[PDB]
Structures are given as C-alpha cells and as structure tokens.
Ligand binder design. Structure first.
Ligand SMILES: *[C@@H]1O[C@H](CO)[C@@H](O)[C@H](O)[C@H]1NC(C)=O
Ligand SMILES: *[C@@H]1O[C@H](CO)[C@@H](O)[C@H](O)[C@H]1NC(C)=O
Ligand SMILES: *[C@@H]1O[C@H](CO)[C@@H](O)[C@H](O)[C@H]1NC(C)=O
Ligand SMILES: *[C@@H]1O[C@H](CO)[C@@H](O)[C@H](O)[C@H]1NC(C)=O
Ligand SMILES: *[C@@H]1O[C@H](CO)[C@@H](O)[C@H](O)[C@H]1NC(C)=O
Ligand SMILES: *[C@@H]1O[C@H](CO)[C@@H](O)[C@H](O)[C@H]1NC(C)=O
Ligand SMILES: *[C@@H]1O[C@H](CO)[C@@H](O)[C@H](O)[C@H]1NC(C)=O
Lengths: 276, 276, 276, 276, 276, 276, 276
C-alpha cells in the first residue's frame, strides 16, 4: 500500500471529512519524511482484523461546531486543534458555511469510520530528497514579516502576481507551502470514512450529501450492494481518516524556522477564510 | 463534452427536474457566452472523482412547495429565486398543478444527484456571434410598454398573429427571447439527476413517475442493471442539474436594456401561468 | 405509425389494461375524426425521448377499486369517469369480478407505463367518410325510448333477433355503436403498458397474470431478455395506454343527438354488466 | 388443430399438471360431444394474440395442498372441486404423496401457463357415434349397488377377473368408464403449461422435476433455446391446461343415470387412492 | 433394448453416478432374473414421452453427504439405504474421499436426469440358467463365519491366495458375489444421467468433472452440439439411472441363505472401505 | 501405444501444461523403469470409455498461482508439490513470469482434460539397461558438496566449461540428470489436455494462447472441425496430462543416493530460476 | 529457409500487421548482421511442433490504440515501444487513420498468430559486407543537425531534390536509412499472421479487411479450403510476425553514431506522420 506516515499536510486547504475532487483529505501532500506488517524504524504499524468500526453523530449549529468536528480528525499531536484558519479554504468548509447561514435549516453530520490500521512515530528524522531540495532553495528571511512591506496578506489574496509581491521572496515561500503544506502527519488511523451531512428544513424537507474518504470511488451510496463493495475496496486502498500532525518548521534548519513560521501565518491569512 | 457555462435559459419554460421531451432542463438555450480539465478564461472548471452524490426528499403540499423545489436547482446567482412565473410554462409544472388540486392525494419528490463537475464565472465578457447578431436586430424600444398598446400580454396569449401585435415590434423581441431565453448560466453543477415524484392516495394506491436529467436515455428505471448503465452514461453526457443564472439584459447595450426587461416581463405574463 | 387521435371508443367493451385477444384496449374502434413529428391541424403531437416511465400499484379490494384503476386510463376529458357500466363487458372485468368474489384471496394491480408520445385536440371537426356515411343511415328517433316498446334492454340481451326488436330501428342504432363505439379519443398517451395482476391466498400461494398493451406480442414476461425486446417493439408499434374521451353524440347532427344518447344508454344496459 | 371441447375426462386417473407418458392430462379421453376461428354451434372459441401468460407458485405442505393445486386446473363447471378421489390414481399424485410423507423436505410447485385460446359451451347436445354406441350397450342397473353383492370395490381392486365380478355387469360399466371417463369438458383454456416441482431438504440440497403439458416434447428444460422452441410448438399443438367439467351421467338416458352414478362411485373407490 | 430388470448389483463396487470405465453403474451385473412396450409377466414397463427431466444440486460437505447422494439413486426397495460400506470400493467414491479431505475446497454435485422409461416387479420368480448353475455350486456353510477361522476379512484384503483362505470355501462364495453381486434390481428408471462434480477453492479457482450414465460415449461435454447428440443416443441405449434393489439371498434356497448373508458381510468388509 | 509409467522426469525443465516444441510435458525423459489392456507386473492400467472429461479455470494473479496450477498436474506421490524451483526453467514459466509482471493485465488459465487411461505402481523394481549403465558410471561423491569447491551453482550457470567445473565430477552428474531427469513417474493419467491462457488488459483487449498436450499436432484451435479431429488423434497418441512422481535417488545404490540428492539440489539452483 | 535474424528494420515505414504490396512487414530490410535446426554462433533457433497458436482481439478507438497494437509485434528489445513516429508512413497506418476519424464507425482488430519458430541473439557482431561498405561511405557529421541548415525536415518532405538539400550530405544519410532502415531485429517469432480489421457502423453495416503476414499469397480468406492451404504454405515460407529490435547506431563506429542518431530523428520527422 501507500505510506501516509510523514506526509505533508496543508491545514488551511485540508478537510478531514473529504472533498468531491479527491478520494482523501484534500490537504494531504507528498511525503516529507523518509523511513526504513513491516515496522518503520522509529515508528510502528498496527494492523487491524477486518475493520475497526466507530460512528459519530453531531448537530452542527454554527461554523464552530463544524470546525470542531473536523479538528477531531486532524489535530495537533495530543489532540489540540491546529487553529490558524484550519480547513477554511476547503470546498466543504465553504459549502457548510453557506448552509449554516440559513437559519431556516438545521444540519447534522454522521461519520462512519472503517479503520484498517494505525501508524505513528515517537520522538533524528531524515526527510525525503524532494523536501530537502525544497528547503535548500528557501531563504533565511520572510520578506512580508518586515513592517510596511508592500506584499501583505491582503495584497497576496487580491493579486499575487503584482509587482508588490513578485519583488519579494514571498512567492518562493508560498510555492514551498503549496507543495508540502504546513504540517506533517505523525500519527494516523487509515481506512475508510463515509460521512453524511443531513440538512432538514426548520413538509419533510430533508437533504443528504455523502462525503467519502478511502477505498475506490463508490457508485451509489443508496445501493446496499454498492456500499458493501466500497468497503471491500477500503481494504485495498486505505487512507488516513483520523490523524495528528506536527508543524513543519520542526524539520527545517534553525536559521529558517522563524521565517517559515511567519510564512505559514501569512499563508493562513491570505488563503484561509475568517468568518467574513 | 458540451459546455453549458454561459448557456441561455428560459426561466418561464425551464424545469430543472426535467421534461419527457428532453434529456436536460427544457429551458436551456444555445450558448450566449463565448470563452477562451482546461480552464476557461474568466472562469473555472472543477472536475469530481466519480460522482458527487446527494439526495433530497420533500412533501409537495401545494404549488409553492413545487416551485421551491425547482428554484433550488435554478436560481439567481446567490440562491435567490428567479420568480416572474418561473417554470410555469413547462409540462412538469402543469402536470403537478393538476395532481396537487386533488386534495385526496399527496405527492412527494425524491431527487438523486449524480454530479460530475462544477463550473462558473466570476465578475468584460464576449458573447457568441449568434447572440451579437441577434442583439443587433433588436430595436431600442419595446412597443407593448406604451400604455393602451393594442398588443397586450393577454392579446399575445390569445393570438400573436393578430394585427394588434404584428404591427408592433413585439414579435421581434419575443423571437429573441424564444431563441436565447431570459437569463444565462453563470454557475452550474453538471452530471445526472434522477427524480421520483411519488403520489399516494389519501388500498395501497401509490403512483411513481421518473424524471431524468443527463446521460443517455434510460430504458428501465425499475431494472437495477438499466439504472446502473444510465449512471455510466452520465460520465459521457453530463448536463446541468443545479445552476445559477443572471438576467440577460446585463449582456445587452444600455440603450436596449430597459426595453428587454419590459420584454421579459411581457413574456413572463403572456407565456407564464399564474395559478389560475 | 398509426394515428389513434379521434379513434372511436366503446366504453362498455373497452378495457384500458388490455385483453388477451388484442394488443391494445379492446374498446378502440376505427377512426372517427379526419385530420390534416408532423402536427395535425387543430391538434398537437408531442414526441418523447425514449420512454416516459411511470409505475402504479393498487390493492383491488372490490369491483369499485378495479373500476377506478381502469377509469384512470380511460376517462372523460378532464378526468371524470365515463360511468354507465364502463368496461363491464370486457373479459378482464369479468375475470376480476370472479376473483374478487372469493373473500379468501387478495389481488393487487401493478402498472408499468412506457409512454412514447402524447397527442390531443383543442376545441369544427371533419369526420371520416366511413363515419359520415354511417351517420347518414341513422334515423332521427330511437324506437326503444318509446314507453312500452317491445324491444327493451332486457329483450335485447336475451334475443336481439326476436320480432320485438327486428321490427324497430334498434338494430340499426346498435350496429352503428358496434362499429364506432360510444365515445372518441380527444387526448392520449401512446406507447406500451405492462400490467401485473397478482393474487395471494388469504402456503405462499401467489398467482400472477400479465396483461400487455402496445408493441409486438411478448414471448415471455419472466424472461429478462424477452421483456426488453418487447420494449424495443413498443417504439415501433405504440398504442394508447392512457387517454381521455368525448361522447360521440357531439359529432352527430342535432336532430339525431338525443336519439343517439338514448341508444348508448340502451347499449350500456343491454351489453354492460351491473354487479349482478 | 384438435378439438378438446366435449372430450371425456377420467377424474380419478387425470392429472392437470401432466404425466411423463403423455403430452397432456392423462385423464383426457376421446371426444364425447359432437359439434357443428370457426364457431361451434352452441359454443364459442376465443383465440388469443400470441400467448396469455400467467404464473403461480405454491408451497405444498400436505396432500390437500397438492389436491387444491390440481383442482384449480380441473374442476366442476363453476370452480367447485370434483372430489371423489380425483387425481389419486395418477403417477404424479403417487409421486408427490411419497415426497410429502418425508417431513425432512419441503416441496413447492411453480406453474407457467402459455394459453393460446379459450373454448366453452353454454347450456340439447349430440354425442359422438362412439359414445352413443357405448351407451346403448350399457344395462339399466349397476350390480354392485345391490347390498352383499360379491363384487365390491375392494374385490375389484384385488382381482377384477374373479368369479365374483365377471358374473355381474360391473365389468361392462367399468369398460365404459375406462373408455370415456367420468366427466366431460365444457370449458377450457388450451395451450401449454410448464410446471416445476421443487423440493428442498429441511447443504443446499434442492431437487427439481419438470412437468409439461402441450406442444411438442421438449428436449432440455434447462437449455434457454430448447425452452423457447417448445413454446413455438405450443402454437402448433395446444392442449387443455385449465378446464371445467360436467358429470357424464347428464349425457345418458334417464333410466341409466342412477346406475352410472353408482358406477363412477364404485370406480372412484376401486381405482382411486384414499390417503392410506 | 437391453433389460436391466432383475440385473445383479454389487452394492460395494457400485456407483450410481457412474465410472470412467463404464457407460453405466459399475456395480450392475449380468441378469439374475428371467422374465416372460411388451409387459414382463409379474412386472411392468412404463415408457415415457421423450425424456422425463429432473435436476438436483447438493453441496457435499463430507463423505456422508456423498453417500446420501448415491443412495438416492441406488437404495433398497422402499428408499432405505443399502448401507454395509455401499459404493466404497468404486473409483468415484475414492476420488471424492480424497477431495473432501482437503478442507480448503468445497465440492458440489449437479445431477441431470434424462429418464426414458420405468420398470419394476411386484411381489415365485425364475432365475437365469447362469444364476441357478452358480447357486448349485455353492456350499451350505460359509467357512469364515466360524470363529478363529484363518481366513478373515483382513486376511482376504491382504492376500486372498494365501493358504489360510484357499483351504476354505471362502473363494467359492466370493467368486459368486464377484459374478452376480449382492443385490438385484427390482425397480428402475432408465435413460441417461449427466452429473457435474464442481470443486471451488476455499482467484476464481474452480474444477469441474463430468460423469455420464447411459447413451453413447459423449465426445465433448462443453460443446452444445455434442451434448445434444448424447441425449439422442440416450434414446437408443437407455440404462438405469435410479433404481431400487433387494438382497440376493431371497433368491437362494433356504439352506444357503444364512451362509450367503455371512458371505456378503465378509465381502463388504474385505472389499469395502471404512472411512480409514 | 507408448508406456510412460516409470518415465524419468526433469522437475526443473518440466511443464505439465505443455511447451511449443513438444507434444507433451517437456520434462518427460526416457524410460527409467522396466516392466513385465495388459497389466504390468507390480502395477495396473485402467482404460476409460472414450474420454474422462474435466475442466478447470483459475485466475493467475502471481507466479505462485501459476506454480500451483502446474503442481496440480505434476506433484509428488500423494499430491505434495515437488518444489525446488520446479518448472522454472521451462519456456512457459518464463513467458508467464513476463506477463504477470505487467500489473496492467490479468491472466486466466482454462484447462480441458481428455483422459483416456490411468496407470500406476504400488510399492523391488528393475530399471532399464540404459539407466543401470548410466548409474554404473556415476561416482559415489558429488564434488560441489565440498565447501569452497570452485564449481558452484553460480559458476555452472555462467560457464560450465570453465576449468573450475571440468576438473570436478560435476559434469558427469549433470549429464546423468540431463538424460534421465530428477524424478520418475509412478502414477499418471494419460490422454490429451488443451489449455487456454487468456490475458485481458486491466477497449476489449484480450489475448489467448493455446497450449496442447497429447494427440497429433492441431492445425487450428479456433476451427471447430480441427479441434474435434485433434481429440480423435488423442485416442491414437495419449500422453501424460496429470501425474505423480518419486525422486530418482530411490532407484540408486545407497552409496550414491546422498551424492545424487546433492546433485539435484545443485541442478535445481543452477538451472532453475528463483523469482529474480 | 530465409534468415530474418539481424535484418534491418525501418520503424517509420514498417507495419507488423502487414501491407498489401508485401507478404511481410513492409519495414523489413536486407540483412545487416552476418552469422556462423542449426544454431547461429551467438544466437539460437527454437523450432516449434506444427504451429504455436495465439489470438488477440482489440477495439481500436483512436490512433493510440492502433499504435499500441502494432508496437506489441515490433518493439525495442524488452518490450518498450520504439516511438519516433513508428509505423506512421505505412499504408495501413494511413488507412486506419482515415477510418478512425469517422466517429460514426467503430473498428476492431483480430490477430491470428501461426508461429513456427523463435530466434534471437544475446549480447562482438560482424555485419554483412553490404552494410559495412554502406557505413564506410557515410560521413562523420550530419549536416541538418547544424542550426539554420537550409535542409530541414520540412524542406526534405516538400522537395528533397532542392538545392538546399542536395548540397548537404543529408541525401547520403537518407539513402543509407532507405536501404537498411533504422533498427535491426534481435529477437523474433516467425511464421504466419492473419489479421482481420472489422469496422461496424455506429442496418448491420459491417466491413472486414484481411491482412496477411507469411506463407504464400492466399486466394480467398472466406474459403475454408483456401485458408487451410495458406497455413500449409506458412510452414514453407515463415516470416517474422512478432519481433524486437535494437537501434542501428549500435553497429556503427563511434565517430558516426551521433550523426546517425540525428539522421534517424530527421528521417522520422520528414517521412513519419504526426497526427496532423
Ligand atoms: C534515516 O534515519 C534513521 C533513523 O530514523 C537512521 O537509522 C538511518 O541511518 C537514516 N538513513 C540513512 C540512509 O542513514
Ligand atoms: C474574449 O474575452 C476575453 C476576456 O473574457 C478576452 O481575453 C479575449 O481577448 C476576448 N476575445 C478575443 C477574440 O479577443
Ligand atoms: C377539415 O377540417 C379542418 C379544420 O379542422 C379544415 O381546415 C379543413 O379544410 C377540412 N378539410 C377539408 C378537406 O376542407
Ligand atoms: C347436433 O346438435 C345441434 C345443436 O347442438 C343441432 O343443431 C344439429 O341439428 C345436430 N346434428 C344434426 C346432424 O342434426
Ligand atoms: C417363469 O415364472 C413365471 C412366473 O413369474 C411362470 O409363469 C413361468 O411358467 C416360469 N417359466 C416357465 C418356463 O415355466
Ligand atoms: C523384474 O522385476 C519383476 C518384479 O517387479 C520380477 O518379477 C522380474 O523377475 C524382473 N525381471 C527379470 C528379468 O527377472
Ligand atoms: C563473426 O563473428 C563471430 C562471433 O559472433 C566470430 O566467431 C567469427 O570469427 C566472425 N567471422 C569471422 C569470419 O571470423
């Protein structure tokens, strides 16, 4: 199978309940860590018998409830929320924000977890060649940290190709974040997750959307046979459905860590959506 | 595939749950906008993995409930209803109006969405050559806006070939509306939609009609195999199943915008059906 | 194809779910109206894409439930039932009447509509040459309307060749009704209809009869392939599966209308079956 | 084709689902009635379009359930069962009686009717020359009706050639019954009937026997092509698959009717099998 | 054709689903009974129209299931199993015993019966000249019935030519059993039988063996044409496919019956295979 | 015909589904055993009626599945696999290894057995004169068993004519193995076997190769007539299609058995292909 | 027979399914390699028994599918496609390109291989005298590799006799390529190959063309006898039907290898057809 331990993660564009254009969390990025059934040196893989099943149901009354339901599946190591406008750039976040503004409807989220294994690290890491080469091209200073820098977070959101930004090294830092994300996975449960978002008016007006992580693309969620076939494909293509992350600056040389932290703060503001 | 972004739309004759004489919404009209996987300049196309699945169920107690269920899939940009006798000239609207008048039966609508991609524009447009040539033949004044004009909306409904109307420029304006519609699509979800309208008496008397948007014509809705084959054809022939529109007068020169707005108001009254 | 718009219809001998000796409703009669894809002057034809599919299921607890299920597919213009012992002379009506008398069984009717087009008129008609010549041979008076006329409805049912009837003009009127029916079709949905009448005892004792309208004769209803081939023949030979009728006396000269109405009343009693 | 209207019928040896040594009901006997597409004087023939299809399924828990399933297809005029040990001398009855005694198995019967026409009489009949000559040789008294007659029903079952019986006229009466039966057909549906008797143990142990009425002998019931070819031969050789009978004594002179009724009662006991 | 009524039958070496070295049951032996379309005195022959078709399917989970499936086609008169290590010396029994020991596979048996006639006796028999002469050479005592007789069943299985056995009359008795068997057929269905033994692993690993009784040798079971030609040869060479037997000692003089019963018990142990 | 009982067998070069350069298994070697319809002393021959037909189908997902499908037809006495790189030097093994490496295709194997007889031995054998003379020329020691012997299995694979090997007795042992093989047949089914290896891409892209054992060379597998003619030649030239073998060292004097076992181990490594 | 091992091959003009003007691949060129049943030094020849039969079927939806079906039979050593506009100058490629442009038809390719032997080399080669003399006349530089050289690939396609090209050494290099090709065969299967290209409209409109490699010219593909006679001639005149090639520059002196590679690139562009 595919190893997701040590994968990069964009906390702003991520969404741990899924995305219609991906079979997994849209924030997962190429592998950042390099490793040595089989146990990776410095970590562990614990395989399950069939699928470890769990279900959750939540009434999502506001954006904060939705944020909390996502943070449960994509948090910092230990369970604390990532914060910093996490998930706010994903399609699912913008879709729910529209529905929760309508005070005439109420939405519920029903998660169904189909976990197949758990993996994690415990801590002297080596990064991939791609990540190391990317880091070697980074400067030691983030230009937008300077006060009255022409390239602000608002300027980047409006036009990143403007002269105010293309003269600074800000585009170099953002290209790095766009490639590898802002965090990386240190612990994960992999398998499948089928989530139903059910909206009821205030007429038995009910709407249901299905969001799927893991396995092969499912043809029909309402078909009993098509749902069962999807779970059989989850064994073949398991993907992270609940994970914990560590900030990426821990993997950079110390002279670049402060600039990268400023870069992800800039990135969270320019790409992330505050509730406005 | 076929581009439906920028397609004209007749809000009066349209019906976003379908029509037995069309594989799509019968209000979709030839392309009005001209554009430059591949991204259109000024817009975007977001392709999905397999099909983005959603289902809705609603009890349709009166004509207003049916109107609301259609407006969900064909609205103004932002979600507001088009209004102005929208959908009232379609076959499906007249069929449901007959069934809802019978107080001894109750009808439910079950939608099944099979969305394959999303497209939209964000706003300096260029129209098609057909639309530009059509606009160049339009006058600057709509004759029926003049008080005591012999060609009224009622006169047009009774006999549009009468001398009262053929002397005015009203037939020229209506031929334009009949060709391109009254609005145009600015955002759309494309794919397939299978809707069941289920009517129960007050005897297990139950009637079910199937209405299909998108894909190839389905041979048997009750056959499990024929339904699955239809979804496989939805990948090949996706069509708009939920979209948002902007009024067409925004695309006309300013000296003709006021006359066109009067023309669509006239058109909505003469062709559209008030609940009488 | 064959035009059924304006066809005569015997409401007493008709049966809109079918007959084992006909591929269509056994009450359909030769064309009464003459007309001028292609649109008939004074009417319309609306062709469908593939087949417009609808299904109904009903528990038939008594003869009235069966009558209602037939009246749905063969009614007066507007939806009102024809009445006047409608369908009571058909084989299917007599078959169901026998089964419903057995209180130890319960019967259900499952309709499957495969509609291919809709046609209708809106109202100065011209009748066929056969119908006009038939009308010219009719008297102005119906003899059995006279009190104490020897030829009563009971006498006609027992022996129509008796002297009591052969001396009156009653046989002339009945020969006209036997040729053209009592009504004529003004609106129709054409295609195919497969109806299952399922009877369950009170042992999994279940009986199922198949009744077919439209297309070519089907070899095996249980064969999946033979059923699909039948639908392909429905495109070639579509027939009325749900229609609305107008009384034939509207097409006769005024001096003969009252006598014809008395003739169809006589015909409905002598040929039709009251529930005895 | 061959006329079966008015055919004699042995209710004891008959079996309306078939017999391996006959292509039809083994109780059908040579024609008893003589008659004058073409309509027989005093009766009717109603030809079907293709085949009128019906299917039945029944769980046969005991001998009474099997008896009821046969009586459905061979009953008295009106639907009442013939009774009097009907069908009990047929091979199929004895075969099923053996299987139903095994309480470790369960048997189901699946009938498939392929009806091609219906025929019947309504009531002054004339019998065939063979039947009239047979009746002329019958006595006016049945000897075994006399109390303490040496030739009893048990004596006939043990040895009909014994002196106790050969001295009476009992062998003359039984030879008549053996030639023409005990009843005669007054109404019938003709065509084909394929019946499956499926027995399941309590291992997927399932047994299926095929019993066929009508058409040409079928080579392979499991072959799809061989089954379809059989139905094509049903058009050529249709045979009664569901019929109603009247007792034969109605066709005898009154002075012999009472003796014949005693003869068929004797015959039903001596040849028929009580459940012992 | 060839008469199999009264044929000898070796219950130990027999196998009613067939043998690759025979066209029939390998336990059928030369005729033991002598008899006098045509009906044998004391018995009956009932000829079928074409072929009486029946099919069975069974999952054979252990040796007992296989034994039961064979006993269905070769049993004592009345249906009771023969027992006494029946069928255990046949090639097919040893082949299946090997496959059922593999717990990683599952085997199914599919029987297809093509019965052409039934024959039987009801009970003063006369045996053939060969059988009578064979019986006249038999002693009145079976030597191995004596306790501590050197010729035991184990000794016969190891070396029947040893001095321990050649001094006794045991070889005389076994030569009789080897010629005529242990039972004889009293009732039989004759025709053809094609049986498929299908073994599936736990990869779509499936194995199928074909075993044929009756008719001419079939060239290709997978060829549709070669299978149909085989059935045409079944009419020419019908053989017993389901029969009932009676022990042979009923045909011996009373002074030899007890010794013969001991001989068949000895034979069943020495030649038959207990599940070890 | 030709006796294959006691034939030598090269387990490394063998392939029981065939070879394009042989009409039989390419591992069959000249006769090793000498023997005395007709029964060989110490063994048996069981002739079949026509052909004993069996068919198998298997999806071959990896090299292990292919190995298992061959081991079914060429195993140790009892059914255990030979192992020791069996079949790995055959052309068919190398061909399949290439196709299974392509993860974009899937291959199935369809076997069709046409068995004509079975033969075997039960155990004091005498070998042929050729085998005895060959054994007399063998040393008592295998030189490559000595540690740090210059002639290793790798050295033999690279250049067997090098000085490192030509000085040892290794070439003498390998010439013996090349002549007689490593095992010998103790039980066999002889006849014909036609195997189809069908490869499907992931476009209906399908490839099929035919591999034939037994009979005369077939001109066209797709021709129905040419296939039937091949089976007629299988009767004339039957060859082993499923057999069991015993190691050859059992036939050597005890002082040479250990050296021969080391020789076949050396041979299996130098000539056989490990999955690299 | 004729040796094709080491034959030159024009990858641009070649076509491994055939050509109407050749009995073999039209890209095969005279022998380039010189060698020493009989085994060539440095290579091998493996003769088959009769013909090794294989069949393939493929739906050719676009030019890429056709390219893939040819590349299967003419690839680089190892199976990788040659590329570089391979096969694009052959008649068959241009014929199929015309048919695949018609979106109203669908074409399938059915290959039938009749392989008689396999040959190959493993690697110090010696070339033929013709090839060596040809190479000695080649320059060390390819003139068209120089930027702004008047003789471009387009100029060569339009007029190779123009002054722009006749002044350079380009015609010398192209004459060499035209004589010996661009690659040479290192491994081959020889025999016959009959390929059917079947085109169906969307009326049972079907077209079939036959393309033949190997043997003598066949008179009638539809004649069963003429097809069989062709296979008998395949034994006499076997030709390569599936082969692998190595680039010719490996056979040139190192000082000319770079210029020859530029020459074949030039040749592939000037003679080969890009999909325009
Ligand atoms: C990668 O890091 C591990 C410790 O996590 C270390 O054992 C290993 O040596 C490193 N890789 C290499 C190639 O040395
Ligand atoms: C069409 O409009 C786009 C902007 O939407 C513009 O870039 C383009 O130049 C216009 N078309 C042409 C032919 O110029
Ligand atoms: C038939 O009636 C139509 C109107 O329904 C009329 O236009 C036409 O003239 C009539 N037929 C003829 C032959 O005039
Ligand atoms: C037979 O009976 C019919 C009435 O069922 C009668 O009309 C006819 O005359 C009779 N046959 C003859 C030969 O008279
Ligand atoms: C054979 O036995 C039958 C009774 O089964 C008997 O009728 C006949 O006489 C016997 N055979 C001879 C030759 O007598
Ligand atoms: C060959 O061996 C058999 C036993 O398998 C033996 O009977 C025979 O005597 C041996 N051959 C000779 C020539 O003795
Ligand atoms: C040709 O090359 C071979 C090796 O492939 C070599 O053995 C031979 O000597 C060469 N030809 C001549 C004439 O030497």
């Amino acid at each position: 199978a595919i190893n997701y331990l040590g994968a990069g993660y964009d906390h702003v564009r991520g969404n741990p309940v899924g995305d219609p254009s991906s079979m997994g969390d849209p924030g997962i990025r190429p592998p950042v860590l390099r490793f040595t059934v089989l146990q990776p040196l410095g970590g562990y893989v614990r395989q399950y018998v069939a699928c470890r099943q769990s279900e959750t149901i939540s009434e999502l009354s506001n954006l904060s409830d939705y944020q909390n339901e996502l943070s449960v599946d994509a948090s910092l190591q230990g369970g604390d929320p990532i914060g910093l406008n996490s998930f706010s750039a994903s399609t699912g976040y913008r879709d729910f924000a529209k529905e929760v503004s309508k005070k005439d409807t109420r939405t519920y989220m029903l998660k169904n977890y189909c976990m197949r294994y758990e993996a994690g690290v415990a801590q002297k890491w080596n990064v991939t060649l791609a990540f190391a080469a990317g880091v070697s091209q980074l400067p030691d200073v983030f230009d937008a940290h300077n006060p009255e820098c022409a390239c602000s977070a608002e300027q980047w959101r409006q036009d990143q190709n403007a002269e105010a930004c293309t003269k600074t090294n800000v585009p170099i830092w953002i290209s790095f974040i766009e490639q590898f994300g802002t965090h990386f996975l240190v612990r994960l449960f992999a398998g499948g997750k089928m989530t139903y978002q059910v909206t009821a008016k205030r007429q038995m007006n009910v709407q249901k959307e299905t969001l799927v992580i893991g396995g092969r693309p499912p043809g029909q969620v309402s078909d009993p046979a098509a749902l069962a076939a999807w779970a059989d494909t989850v064994e073949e293509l398991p993907m992270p459905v609940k994970f914990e992350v560590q900030p990426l600056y821990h993997l950079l040389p110390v002279e670049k860590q402060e600039a990268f932290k400023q870069a992800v703060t800039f990135y969270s503001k320019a790409v992330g959506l505050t509730p406005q």
